[PDB]
TrEMBL record, chain A:
The family this protein is said to belong to: Belongs to the universal ribosomal protein uL15 family.
Signal peptide (from-to): none
Name under which the protein is recorded: Large ribosomal subunit protein uL15
Purpose of the protein: Binds to the 23S rRNA.
Superkingdom to which the source organism belongs: Bacteria
Subunit (UniProt): Part of the 50S ribosomal subunit.
Full-sequence portion shown in this chain: 74 to 144 of 144
Chain ranges of the Large ribosomal subunit protein uL15/eL18 domain: 12-70
From TrEMBL, chain B:
Pfam families: Ribosomal_L35p
PANTHER family in UniProt: 54S RIBOSOMAL PROTEIN BL35M, LARGE RIBOSOMAL SUBUNIT PROTEIN BL35M
GO molecular function, one term: structural constituent of ribosome
GO biological process terms held by the UniProt record: translation
Protein name: Large ribosomal subunit protein bL35
PROSITE patterns in the record: RIBOSOMAL_L35 (PS00936)
Gene Ontology cellular component list: cytosolic large ribosomal subunit
Basic residues: bias regions: 1-27
Keyword annotations of the record: Ribonucleoprotein, Ribosomal protein
Source species: Pseudomonas aeruginosa
Basic and acidic residues biased stretches: 52-63
Record flagged with keyword Ribosomal protein: yes
Positions of the UniProt region annotated as Disordered: 1-63
Automatic annotation (TrEMBL), chain C:
Ribosomal protein listed as a keyword: yes
Protein keywords: Ribonucleoprotein, Ribosomal protein
A Gene Ontology term for the protein's cellular component: cytosolic large ribosomal subunit
PROSITE patterns named in the record: RIBOSOMAL_L27 (PS00831)
The species this protein was found in: Pseudomonas aeruginosa
Coiled-coil ranges from the UniProt annotation: none
PANTHER family: LARGE RIBOSOMAL SUBUNIT PROTEIN BL27M (PTHR15893:SF0), RIBOSOMAL PROTEIN L27 (PTHR15893)
Protein name listed in UniProt: Large ribosomal subunit protein bL27
Family: Belongs to the bacterial ribosomal protein bL27 family.
Single GO MF annotation: ribosome binding
From TrEMBL, chain D:
Annotated organism of origin: Pseudomonas aeruginosa
Gene Ontology molecular function, alphabetical: structural constituent of ribosome
PROSITE patterns the UniProt entry points to: RIBOSOMAL_L33
Domain of life of the source: Bacteria
Residue stretches in coiled coil: none
Gene: rpmG
Entry keywords, A to Z: Ribonucleoprotein, Ribosomal protein
Protein name according to UniProt: Large ribosomal subunit protein bL33
RNA sequence: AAUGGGUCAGCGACUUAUAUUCAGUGGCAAGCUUAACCGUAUAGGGUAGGCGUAGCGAAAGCGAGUCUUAAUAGGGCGU
RNA sequence: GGCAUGCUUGAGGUUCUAACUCUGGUCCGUAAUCCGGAUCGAGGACAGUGUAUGGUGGGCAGUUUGACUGGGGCGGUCUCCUCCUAAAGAGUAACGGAGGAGUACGAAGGUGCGCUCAGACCGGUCGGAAAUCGGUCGCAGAGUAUAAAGGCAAAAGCGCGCUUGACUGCGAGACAGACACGUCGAGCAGGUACGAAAGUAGGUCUUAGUGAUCCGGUGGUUCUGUAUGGAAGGGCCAUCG
């Protein structure tokens, strides 16, 4: 398990927050499979989450601030 | 890392961000005596007392 | 023939004297069976432990026939 | 004062636990007490804790 | 009227290494830092890994809340 | 039932030689009789030896055998309750003076309704200083499941009718206190028993009646379940040594 704050979604590049895109920007760890996103601040840019499952309050922020939650 | 913790105190003390949790004692194997007021007030998970902190935090290798 | 064996001194007494301010669970008197009786706003628990229910000032008054000691709490 | 168990009437494995002087009164009792599963009072009975 | 010392001159007792906690003074700062190893070798590369930015719970899990509970009531811990 | 005979197999009994055995005899290696090899003689599936298991085993070894103590040895004492020492708040020692517990109770608990003691005395059939009954006087001198202390006429003492609140989830507040344990508890929500209804009930007049952790045993529990689907084993809740 690991989890990502909403504020750190503006720290990847390429605006596709995959599973491997969080690893090469060393934001999470190696050998981590299941990831969440919880509410800890404003995101800052429109990114497309996929492969990761946010909480209820987080997806109310990403869908409003230009992002798109698909898989 | 040349600092081995004790294995007993790592199994009786989980650590949270508000101290050290621990289960209450005295609740096993003779229980048909005690009044409930005493059973339901030993069921929770307390946090540790201040005289006991710096004793355990040397047993657990935190110091 | 040999006699040591005392007990361990229960800490009985009277807390909260004549002009104190109280709360709702204060205890005011441990007791050993009704030196003081339940006055106006106090409790008289299981082993004759008095306790408060409302807030104010302790009184310690003697009333009535039999001359018994009434601990009442006055809203003053 | 041997100790006994009081198994519930309904399906639940909830029970009470007390003691009873077996020597003076041999027969079983049928006390009606509360049940924390069905959330109402039913009658109980048993002995024989093991 | 208890111990020790015949006097002199030489030597004679809180050290090191690896982990970790608290203070003093410094560097960068929601981020700080690399170990082996490479290297024209005290420079440079190397961010794997660690500590932090969010908790509560035995756990699954849910998340600025969560656990107990028939609980939406209270209460514990947290912001 | 057995009839037969078979098929296999155990347990016992006798016999046989071919395994093993010979600290037997005479040849050979050899100039040695250790050791082999050849042949006769004896024992013979026993003895003996591996490995698994019972018994005996100071022959041998590693170790244990407490403290307080008007020196320590002998004796007495190690935990809990009440009184005195204890100086009119709490606390407070002595191998200082006196006593008690290691439990009982399904009503000896809840609730509604009723009701008062011991003793003194006088009258009264076989009792007779004293049984039951009647009466006056009483003014707690009785009673309280169990030691003493503190209490008890809304009687906390006594009797009768229904019953299971000897409930589950909690608990603001405090008292104590090195810590671990401890004591009292308004009130809230669930579902109840009395009472016409306010209301009372989270055991007994209060204070002694008891022992952590680790182990293991039994009832509930998807919370986990080492590729996957299940299980074993954990975990949590309840309860036993």
């Amino acid at each position: 398990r690991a989890e990502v704050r909403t504020s750190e979604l503006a720290k990847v590049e390429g605006d596709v927050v995959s599973l491997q895109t969080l690893k090469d920007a060393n934001l999470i760890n190696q050998h981590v499979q299941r990831v969440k996103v919880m509410l800890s601040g404003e995101v800052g840019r429109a990114v497309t989450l996929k492969g990761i499952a946010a909480t209820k309050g987080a997806r109310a922020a990403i869908e409003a601030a230009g992002g798109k939650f698909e898989d | 890392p040349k600092m081995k913790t004790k294995s007993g105190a790592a199994k009786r003390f989980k650590k949270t961000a508000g101290g050290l949790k621990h289960k209450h004692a005295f609740k096993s194997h003779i229980l048909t005596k005690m009044t409930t007021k005493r059973k339901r007030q030993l069921r929770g998970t307390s946090m540790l007392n201040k005289s006991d902190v710096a004793r355990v935090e040397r047993s657990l290798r935190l110091r | 023939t040999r006699n040591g064996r005392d007990s361990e001194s229960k800490r009985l007494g009277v807390k909260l004297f004549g002009g104190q301010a109280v709360k709702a669970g204060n205890i005011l008197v441990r007791l050993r069976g009704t030196k003081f009786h339940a006055g106006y706003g106090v409790g008289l628990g299981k082993d004759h432990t008095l306790f408060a229910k409302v807030d104010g000032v302790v009184k310690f008054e003697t009333k009535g026939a039999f001359g018994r000691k009434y601990v009442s709490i006055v809203a003053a | 004062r041997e100790l006994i168990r009081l198994v519930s009437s309904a399906g639940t494995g909830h029970f009470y636990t007390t003691d009873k002087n077996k020597r003076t009164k041999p027969e079983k009792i049928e006390i009606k007490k509360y049940d924390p599963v069905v959330r109402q009072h039913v009658i109980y009975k048993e002995a024989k804790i093991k």
